[PDB]
Here is the input.
Amino acid sequence: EDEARRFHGYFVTGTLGYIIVAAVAHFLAWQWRPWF
Amino acid sequence: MTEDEARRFHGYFVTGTLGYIIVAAVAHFLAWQWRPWF
Amino acid sequence: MTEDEARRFHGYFVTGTLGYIIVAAVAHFLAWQWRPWF
Amino acid sequence: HRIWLMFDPRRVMVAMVGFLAVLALVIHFILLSSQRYSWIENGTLSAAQAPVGASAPAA
Amino acid sequence: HRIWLMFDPRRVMVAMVGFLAVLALVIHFILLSSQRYSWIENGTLSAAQAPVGA
Amino acid sequence: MHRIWLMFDPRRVMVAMVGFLAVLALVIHFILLSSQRYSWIENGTLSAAQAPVGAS
Amino acid sequence: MHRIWLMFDPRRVMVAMVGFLAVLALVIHFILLSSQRYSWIENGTLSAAQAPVGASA
Amino acid sequence: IWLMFDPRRVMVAMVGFLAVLALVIHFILLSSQRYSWIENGTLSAAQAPVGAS
Amino acid sequence: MHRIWLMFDPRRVMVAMVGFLAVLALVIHFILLSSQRYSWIENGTLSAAQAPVGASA
Amino acid sequence: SDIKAVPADSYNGSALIPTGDPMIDGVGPSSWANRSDTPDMTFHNTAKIVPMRLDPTYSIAKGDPDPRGLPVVAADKQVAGTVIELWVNRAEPQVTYYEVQLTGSERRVMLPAGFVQWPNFGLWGNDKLLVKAITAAQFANVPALKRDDQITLLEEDMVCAYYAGGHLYAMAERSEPII
Amino acid sequence: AMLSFEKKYRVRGGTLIGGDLFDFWFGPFYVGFFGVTTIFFVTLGTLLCVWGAAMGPTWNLWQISIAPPDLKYGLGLAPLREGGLWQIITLCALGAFGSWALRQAEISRKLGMGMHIPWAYGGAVLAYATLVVIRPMLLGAWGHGFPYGIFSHLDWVSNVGYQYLHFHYNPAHMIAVTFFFTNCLALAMHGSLILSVTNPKKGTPVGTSETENVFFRDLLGYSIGAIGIHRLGLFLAVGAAVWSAICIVISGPFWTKGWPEWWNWWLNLPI
Amino acid sequence: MLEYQNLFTRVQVRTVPEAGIEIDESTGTRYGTGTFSYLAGKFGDAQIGPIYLGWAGVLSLIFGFMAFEIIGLNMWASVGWDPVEFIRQLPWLALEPPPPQYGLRVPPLAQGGWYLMAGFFLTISILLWWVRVYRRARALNMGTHLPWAFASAIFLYSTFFFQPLLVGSWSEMVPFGIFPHLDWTSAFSIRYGNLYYNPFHALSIAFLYGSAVLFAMHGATILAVARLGGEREIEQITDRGTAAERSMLFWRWTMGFNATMESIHRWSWWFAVLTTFSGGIGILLTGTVVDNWYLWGVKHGLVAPYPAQNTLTEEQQQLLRGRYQGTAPDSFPSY
Amino acid sequence: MHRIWQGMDPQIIMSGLGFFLAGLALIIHMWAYSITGWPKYKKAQYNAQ
Amino acid sequence: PVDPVTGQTIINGEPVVGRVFIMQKTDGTVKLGKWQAQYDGEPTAPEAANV
Amino acid sequence: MQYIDGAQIALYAFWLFFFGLIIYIRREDKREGYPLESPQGPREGWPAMPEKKTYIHRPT
Ligand SMILES: CCCCCCCCCCCCCC(=O)OC[C@H](COP(=O)(O)OCC(O)COP(=O)(O)OC[C@@H](COC(=O)CCCCCCCCCCCCC)OC(=O)CCCCCCCCCCCCC)OC(=O)CCCCCCCCCCCCC
Ligand SMILES: CCCCCCCCCCCCCC(=O)OC[C@H](COP(=O)(O)OCC(O)COP(=O)(O)OC[C@@H](COC(=O)CCCCCCCCCCCCC)OC(=O)CCCCCCCCCCCCC)OC(=O)CCCCCCCCCCCCC
Ligand code: BCL
Ligand code: BCL
Ligand SMILES: CC[C@H]1c2cc3[nH]c4c(c3C)C(=O)[C@H](C(=O)OC)c4c3nc(cc4[nH]c(cc(n2)[C@@H]1C)c(C(C)=O)c4C)[C@@H](C)[C@@H]3CCC(=O)OC/C=C(\C)CCC[C@H](C)CCC[C@H](C)CCCC(C)C
Ligand SMILES: CC(C)=CCC/C(C)=C/CC/C(C)=C/CC/C(C)=C/CC/C(C)=C/CC/C(C)=C/CC/C(C)=C/CC/C(C)=C/CC1=C(C)C(=O)c2ccccc2C1=O
Ligand SMILES: COC(C)(C)C/C=C/C(C)=C/C=C/C(C=O)=C/C=C/C(C)=C/C=C/C=C(C)/C=C/C=C(\C)CC/C=C(C)/C=C/C=C(\C)C(=O)O
Ligand SMILES: COC(C)(C)C/C=C/C(C)=C/C=C/C(C=O)=C/C=C/C(C)=C/C=C/C=C(C)/C=C/C=C(\C)CC/C=C(C)/C=C/C=C(\C)C(=O)O
Ligand SMILES: COC(C)(C)C/C=C/C(C)=C/C=C/C(C=O)=C/C=C/C(C)=C/C=C/C=C(C)/C=C/C=C(\C)CC/C=C(C)/C=C\C=C(/C)C(=O)O
Ligand SMILES: COC(C)(C)C/C=C/C(C)=C/C=C/C(C)=C/C=C/C(C)=C/C=C\C=C(C)\C=C\C=C(C)\C=C\C=C(C)\C=C\CC(C)(C)OC
Ligand SMILES: CCCCCCCCCCCCO[C@@H]1O[C@H](CO)[C@@H](O[C@H]2O[C@H](CO)[C@@H](O)[C@H](O)[C@H]2O)[C@H](O)[C@H]1O
Ligand SMILES: [Fe+3]
Here is the structure.
């Protein structure tokens, strides 16, 4: 369906944005107080 | 619900979300000046 | 529930709230004379 | 003034009387529980002998 | 007055009698167990001899 | 800006707003009453220099 | 963003997000109030140098 | 791809799981000694607590 | 080994296995967290030579 | 369209006031649900609720009074009729209905067994059937059945609803507050 | 909002106190005179509970405790800060529970139903009243009641139980515990039976009322009726509360020694 | 005078006893034809009908009777085989677990061996009864909800075996006795520091009270609409009548939300099952993860503060320290 | 080699690229702050006097 | 400190009008802390069992 | 770690399961009598309406 191809693009973009905003957060926390 | 009303609602919803986040950012700036947590 | 019939109840309600608040203000003045809280 | 078309005046009156009764009783009871304003026991004290609370760690 | 057109007298006065009785009982009972106004025990004391909370 | 009243009717909004505001006000007043610095029924008449402060 | 309101009810989303944000704000404010460093009702007048700090190694 | 799973249910479940997991991790960190950031967040990495050897 | 999907519903199998795998991951992570040697939140900064070891008998 | 009840006022949440007779109109506690117009069946595809005359195997346990030939006293302490037949539930053996012949006869009405009380809670002499909900005059308005050998679920609900609604709509002092 | 079938049932009449004034619906709730009274008592009692929490040393939900007065104030209204607040909260709770029962009676009188639900709730109300009114009156002090706190009332239960050395030996406590356990067992059986008949083995039709009786007759040899199981559940659940009230009201007012010693009568039978 | 409360039935109707739905009878059969009890018919159904017996039921009966016989004979031997003392002291008698010093090793026959035999046989019979319940359910094409509720009950029962195994001693098991098993309950709470502060114990208490609440509510609701045909819940579920509609509306108007005629039984099922499930978890956690529940409650902020009732001096704190309980004296000293 | 774009909304590509570049720039800026010792030394200069 | 002339309580160098009392919560209760602090003032740990 | 212990972890696992169970039972509670009747249109609380469920009947 066309729907499962237009919705999919926005879902993938949102997932990527969320994941790598989380990556920024983890890098900040590592600089502040590393856990390893 | 059709496309036009969805667009008109989306504009206001996005503006409200971003404005609320900006106001919370100012609140966090004030709290940081008062007593920083890092 | 006409306009003419809501206006009357609004007048009495506003006068009653007026009077109640003023009488309570007098009570607080008397209580302040007896034992102030600030 | 047209608020009485959206709300029943009778129900509003009952609700307001109930709310004011509860608030008045709660405030009078809170004051009765206090030390400075337990007027049944210490109402005859002047304002210069009425209790005033102070901090324990700073005492 | 027109309030009796909005509120039935029979119901209103029964409710007010109940509330008034409850309030009077609560006040009398609060006074009865206080130190200053325990009139069943210390009602014969004068106003100078009556207890005063510190 | 008035179209919100076409999505949320005024009656329910006013009832919810009144209830939430009352609960929040009572909660804040009670939190202040339970504290040492703002127990105004007891201290109340103390000046700002005499009021309690939390430990450093 | 293209088809999020034909697919999700705006009224439902508004009510749910208002409830979630109210609960989260209450939880954060209460966590801060329960702490020692950020018990602002009692020690809010302290400067940042006098505020309590947790124990160090 | 998104034909055998009803994207709506997927999104609600994913949001709920992510919120629960984030709350759990944040609270576990808040209950620890090394990462009790409300109280000891101003300490440097050298002054932060470390578990016993 | 392919014709199991005409014999087992793919959707129910995937839901069951994702649930089982998530439960297993949580259980293992929490067991490791409750141990002495792998309490990585507290002692993750220790080197492998300073990490706790069970009593040698 | 079939809700014979006008709102008291325009404020939402207000109670409705029936226009005609609530008992037959079907409003308030006199209302019934539109169930299927087929009889209730047993495990063997037989009518579940049947008169005792249609099944000779059933009987009345020794020790229990026989309600047949007993007067049925109504809410107004007026005898409305006499019991002439018992409808029983075949799946679960119990008394479910009482067929009552009217004082003027010529017709019969169904009386649910759950609305029937016995004198002295069935401890002392049981010589009359007490029905506190409906008065004697209203027994003539109990909805009739299509057949005399089976009763559908719709008729079941209709009869039960009519009898239940008379705990509020029989007299005038019943729908009115005690003070 | 309203259910699909709700509208035809929302009519006037059936109230005990009041008329058309208190005969409306606030959202899904029905408001009567006793609904208004319930709101009044609930609000006053809850606000006084919050005040008692504010007076105490903590805001922790588990540790909040509003305690009854000392025994020395016997049957008198103690000072508010020394247990009188507990007494006022108790009065509010009694009013609220009575109003809840009467409002339920009004609602059942409006749908054409029987009066069973208010009377069933009356058993729990009677147990609470025995705890805070009847037993403290017989013992002669309001300080015999239990404190209002999530875990402090557990401490009260523990100490009151050990006031009689071994509270397990209370015969009425044993009967009440049996009632509770049998009620839980019967509830599990009834829920399972109904669900298994309406949700049978996949591919098979929905079972009938004879299937229930046949199953329980095959398993236990006896099957109580469809009406019988509901009668039994009501009797078990309400009797648990009634026997709880009996068990607590005999400890202190009637028996002051250790409960095990009470079994002397059984060991001293003439046989 | 009063409305018919549907509490008792005045007119009973008799018929030929119901033989039962045709079921497979290759491994077991139905015994009896079906008799009628008048007193039982007053309150509910009157037929004391046939009972099915098969492999699992017979085996369960044999094992359970063996456990019952072992328990009873040990109780009888504990009073010196006196029948008068056996009946008089029956609530105080017990079959006692082994001594603590044996751990998990087999004890002497007169000092806990009989206890373990009886426990094993009782466990086997309970599991065989579970199999019988499952088979009786599936023979009538019903769902297996009752088997999985009985499984929750069995889980709580099996924690009384698994917790003593986890702490490492059969002495911690529950004795077979009316009063002594209550003694064990009290001593278990005392030993591990006030089981009131076990969160899963509090949870299971909440579910037990809620089961009583739910059954009172459901029974009163169905009895209140039985005049409208409400007790026939299957038909009210598959064809919703006015009784189900009124039952829903009563609770919707009362507490603002409601269930359906079918999902109220889901509520009941889950409350009853959770009562034993959370309790079993709480028992399994005791003595293995937490040894003092009051101290766990203090750690997690569960314990309300009270003013100190006593203060101890420096020498009193050393003096008032005691000693952990040890073994009983095996000699009668002469002084 | 321009046909990879066929079938994709350009705005989605630009949004994903912007997210990538924002996160990468933030991470590498923090990395470089730690490596170079800036602005710590200049901040120390302006706070010492 | 108390003013030796007017008999008035002084708080941070300021006199107070009234009878100053030290505020406390209900019946002088204090929130509990760590579980290990439950043994401050209690007797030391009991000795090992006699077996 | 030190503050976290097995009883706490198990308790929060139970809380999560209990909330999921309450959601499921509330989903079942709306199988009859929904959607609600309101002037603003059809109404569904949380959780939303479930899919239509049909039963199986024996042939005649
Ligand atoms: C735990 C889970 C939670 C869960 C919480 C979240 C979920 C809640 C779900 C609740 C059920 C479903 C929703 C629903 O239908 O709700 C009913 C109502 C819509 O009602 P409706 O369908 O329009 O039907 C109303 C109809 O009956 C018409 O009523 P009318 O408008 O004529 O008036 C009825 C009432 C109100 O009277 C008014 O005048 C209303 C406006 C003024 C209110 C305050 C008046 C008092 C003075 C100021 C106080 C305030 C001053 C600041 O009139 C009555 O008589 C009814 C009330 C009782 C009166 C007797 C008692 C008197 C004493 C009361 C003392 C205490 C209260 C003050 O809906 C709404 O209002 C929508 C918004 C939701 C409201 C509740 C929000 C609660 C927020 C709580 C936040 C904190 C949580 C911890
Ligand atoms: C002695 C030791 C034991 C001691 C303690 C023992 C406790 C026992 C607990 C038992 C729980 C279920 C109770 C029950 O209703 O049983 C009846 C049913 C038998 O029914 P039937 O004879 O087949 O009848 C057929 C039909 O009538 C069933 O209809 P009914 O209405 O009874 O059941 C409705 C079904 C509908 O199923 C669905 O819609 C499919 C999806 C169900 C959920 C799947 C995922 C669950 C989570 C997985 C991770 C779970 C991780 C924990 O529904 C049910 O039976 C249960 C409905 C859900 C109940 C609440 C779930 C809440 C979950 C919250 C999660 C957290 C959210 C934040 O028995 C069953 O076992 C049903 C399930 C049978 C299929 C296998 C399921 C498991 C497959 C994977 C393991 C395979 C073996 C190794
Ligand atoms: C020690 C390191 C050196 C230095 C070395 C370099 C080098 C080497 C390079 C840069 C580059 C750049 N540097 Mg640098 N840089 C320094 C200090 C700074 C400072 C500063 C005030 O300290 C600033 C503002 C900048 C700015 C910049 C950018 C113009 C540019 C990266 C662009 C890009 O792709 O963005 C990403 C593009 C976007 C559209 C996203 C921007 C995202 C923002 C930053 C995210 C945070 C804000 C957030 C959205 C706000 C809303 C949310 C909340 C409400 C708060 N530099 C110091 C002196 N910098 C790079 C470049 O291209 O230079 C020409 C590069 O290679
Ligand atoms: C001083 C005593 C302690 C205490 C110690 C304990 C202990 C110890 C336990 C409980 C447990 C429970 N307690 Mg207690 N409890 C106290 C105070 C209370 C109070 C109160 C008002 O004070 C209440 C209401 C409760 C209530 C509860 C229940 C919620 C729970 C048990 C459910 C249950 O048994 O189902 C009944 C179900 C079963 C017993 C399951 C097994 C049934 C089996 C399958 C049946 C087999 C029958 C067999 C075939 C028959 C024949 C035998 C013949 C010999 C052949 N406790 C205090 C604090 N409590 C239990 C629990 O779960 O705790 C977490 C538990 O073990
Ligand atoms: C949801 C949890 C609740 C629950 C659920 C539950 N229990 C269940 C079930 C369910 C759903 C069943 O399916 C199952 C059952 O069949 O119930 C009818 C069962 C059951 N719950 C039982 C009991 C029970 N349940 C309890 C508790 C509860 N069960 C919880 C509250 C308790 C308590 C409170 O302690 C008990 C005692 C049984 C009735 C039954 C399981 C039967 C079983 O396993 O039997 C095995 C068989 C034997 C042990 C044979 C014994 C034979 C005789 C007892 C001895 C010999 C007698 C002699 C012949 C005559 C007399 C002596 C002579 C000298 C006179
Ligand atoms: C013959 C024989 C053998 C007898 C043996 C029986 C024996 C021995 C029994 C023991 C006897 C003894 C001594 C026991 C004492 C029993 C007592 C004290 C009896 C109480 C009588 C009784 C019926 C109980 C309660 C009375 C009731 C129901 C009161 C209601 C009165 C009424 C209708 C008025 C409404 C006002 C009320 C109820 C007040 C609450 C109320 C208040 C106060 C508002 O301000 C308010 C404002 C706005 C909105 C709402 C409210 C609101 O709800
Ligand atoms: C102690 O530390 C712990 C706490 C443990 C760690 C924390 C952990 C966690 C997990 C935190 C979670 C954070 C989080 C997750 O992302 C938080 C997520 C936050 C989010 C998304 C906020 C978004 C808010 C958006 C708002 C307010 C929008 C408002 C819109 C308005 C006002 C306009 C609408 C009006 C209209 C449209 C009218 C027109 C009508 C029209 C036209 C009409 O109707 O016609
Ligand atoms: C310890 O500290 C804590 C406690 C914590 C701190 C507390 C904090 C808080 C939260 C305080 C809240 C305060 C508050 C607001 O929220 C308080 C709000 C007060 C208000 C609004 C009071 C209003 C009173 C109104 C009155 C009395 C009106 C009477 C009207 C009359 C008599 C007219 C009727 C006449 C009629 C009918 C005849 C005409 C009929 C006609 C013509 C007809 O018949 O038609
Ligand atoms: C102590 O340590 C312990 C904790 C124990 C160790 C931990 C262990 C474990 C088990 C960790 C688990 C990790 C994990 C996996 O399990 C982690 C999994 C993470 C994942 C996958 C995250 C993905 C997030 C995706 C998001 C946010 C997407 C948002 C999408 C948006 C905004 C776009 C929506 C809008 C659209 C599409 C518009 C069109 C709609 C249209 C057209 C329409 O709808 O019609
Ligand atoms: C006429 O007299 C005779 C003697 C002929 C018959 C009369 C009998 C009478 C009067 C019997 C009376 C019985 C009574 C009063 C019984 C009371 C029982 C009670 C109250 C029991 C309560 C609780 C008991 C519990 C919870 C016991 C649980 C035991 C468990 C879980 C044991 C498990 C053991 C296992 C699995 C053992 C395994 C064997 C291993 C593997 C360890 O082998 C080495
Ligand atoms: C082994 C011994 C026998 C065990 C079984 C005993 C069976 C009988 C006891 C259980 C039933 C007791 O029966 C009980 O009767 C009393 C009247 O006294 C009823 O009434 C009681 O509760 C109601 C509820 O509000 C109160 O209004 C009333 O004042 C009070 O007496 C109870 O609702 C009913 O539960
Ligand atoms: Fe039922």
